[PDB]
PDB file of C-alpha atoms in Angstrom:
ATOM      1  CA  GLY A   1      -0.162  -0.351  -0.182  1.00 56.23           C
ATOM      2  CA  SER A   2       1.340   3.580   0.646  1.00 53.81           C
ATOM      3  CA  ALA A   3       4.534   3.904   2.626  1.00 55.10           C
ATOM      4  CA  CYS A   4       4.337   7.569   4.198  1.00 55.56           C
ATOM      5  CA  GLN A   5       5.566   8.143   7.578  1.00 57.14           C
ATOM      6  CA  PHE A   6       4.464  10.118  10.789  1.00 56.55           C
ATOM      7  CA  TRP A   7       6.028  13.529   9.882  1.00 60.65           C
ATOM      8  CA  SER A   8       8.978  12.961   7.770  1.00 60.80           C
ATOM      9  CA  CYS A   9       6.903  13.782   4.480  1.00 62.00           C
ATOM     10  CA  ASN A  10       5.923  17.212   6.216  1.00 62.57           C
ATOM     11  CA  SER A  11       9.390  18.195   7.101  1.00 61.29           C
ATOM     12  CA  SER A  12      10.564  17.135   3.417  1.00 59.94           C
ATOM     13  CA  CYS A  13       7.580  19.576   2.276  1.00 63.18           C
ATOM     14  CA  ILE A  14       8.673  22.457   4.934  1.00 64.53           C
ATOM     15  CA  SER A  15      12.307  21.920   3.105  1.00 67.44           C
ATOM     16  CA  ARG A  16      10.961  22.692  -0.288  1.00 65.96           C
ATOM     17  CA  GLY A  17       9.428  25.705   1.477  1.00 69.43           C
ATOM     18  CA  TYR A  18       5.829  24.574   1.814  1.00 69.23           C
ATOM     19  CA  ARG A  19       2.908  25.238   4.026  1.00 68.24           C
ATOM     20  CA  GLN A  20       2.548  21.868   4.809  1.00 65.47           C
ATOM     21  CA  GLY A  21       2.662  18.143   3.404  1.00 65.36           C
ATOM     22  CA  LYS A  22      -0.299  15.417   3.111  1.00 63.65           C
ATOM     23  CA  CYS A  23      -0.075  11.839   2.368  1.00 65.80           C
ATOM     24  CA  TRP A  24      -3.176  11.700  -0.468  1.00 66.70           C
ATOM     25  CA  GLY A  25      -3.908  11.274  -3.971  1.00 69.32           C
ATOM     26  CA  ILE A  26      -5.135   8.651  -6.476  1.00 66.36           C
ATOM     27  CA  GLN A  27      -3.068   5.468  -7.720  1.00 65.35           C
ATOM     28  CA  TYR A  28       0.619   6.573  -6.854  1.00 62.82           C
ATOM     29  CA  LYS A  29       2.413   5.770  -3.417  1.00 65.10           C
ATOM     30  CA  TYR A  30       4.430   9.149  -2.728  1.00 63.12           C
ATOM     31  CA  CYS A  31       3.198  11.896  -0.394  1.00 61.39           C
ATOM     32  CA  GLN A  32       2.496  15.638  -1.570  1.00 60.70           C
ATOM     33  CA  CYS A  33       2.372  19.135  -0.187  1.00 57.92           C
ATOM     34  CA  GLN A  34       0.551  22.682  -0.470  1.00 56.24           C
TER      35      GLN A  34
END
């Protein structure tokens, strides 16, 4: 299934300068931000 961690996606997104990250979508595995 999906393989996103507790907050390691959220830290990756904040490191790209995003407002927050969120493990959501369709078909794919990888976590995304906003």
